[PDB]
Amino acid sequence: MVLSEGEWQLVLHVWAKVEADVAGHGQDILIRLFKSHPETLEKFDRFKHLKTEAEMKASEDLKKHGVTVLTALGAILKKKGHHEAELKPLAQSHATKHKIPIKYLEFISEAIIHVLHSRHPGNFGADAQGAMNKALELFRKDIAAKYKELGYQG
Ligand code: HEM
C-alpha cells in the first residue's frame, strides 16, 4: 500500500517518543514478544537460555539487541516508504540465516503496537495506531516480496 504524509507524521511523532529511551522500549517489546509467543524465543540461540522476565530484564545483551532492532526499524520508518536499501540486507539475513517467518514478523509488529499503546496513549490514539499498523504492514509486505526473490517460503 501507500501511506499519506499525514499518516507518516503520526508514525514519526510517536517514534520521536520511543527515541527518548530506545533501550527501555526495546526491552519491553522483546519481552512482550517472547511472553505472547514463546516459540519466537527459540529462534535466538543467544537468548533462549533466558527463563524468566526477570532474567530478560537483567540481560545487557538482550537490551543491546533491542536497541539494534528498534534503531534499524526507525531508519526504515524515517524513509517513509523509500526503504529498499535498508530492506535488502535485513531480508537476506532474516530469510537465510535466522529463518524468520512472516508470521513471526507479524508477532513482533503486534508487540510493538501493544507497547506503544501502553506507554504512549497521548501519541498513540486510534488514528495513530492505524498509521503505525499501515507502516508495519508495508514493511512486512516488502520483506515478504524480498523473501520470495531470495527463495524463502516466509
Ligand atoms: C521489526 C522487525 C525486525 C527487525 C527490524 C530486526 C532487525 C534485526 C537486526 C538489525 C539484526 C542484526 C543484523 C542482522 O543479523 O540482520 C537482527 C538479528 C537477529 N534477528 Fe531480527 N529483526 C526483526 C524481527 C525479528 C524476529 C521476529 C525474529 C525472530 C523471532 C528475529 C530474530 C533475529 C535473530 C535470531 C538475529 C540474530 C541475533 C543474534 O544471535 O545476534 N528478528 N535483527
Ligand SMILES: [Cl-]
Ligand atoms: Cl520531541
Ligand SMILES: [Cl-]
Ligand atoms: Cl536496565
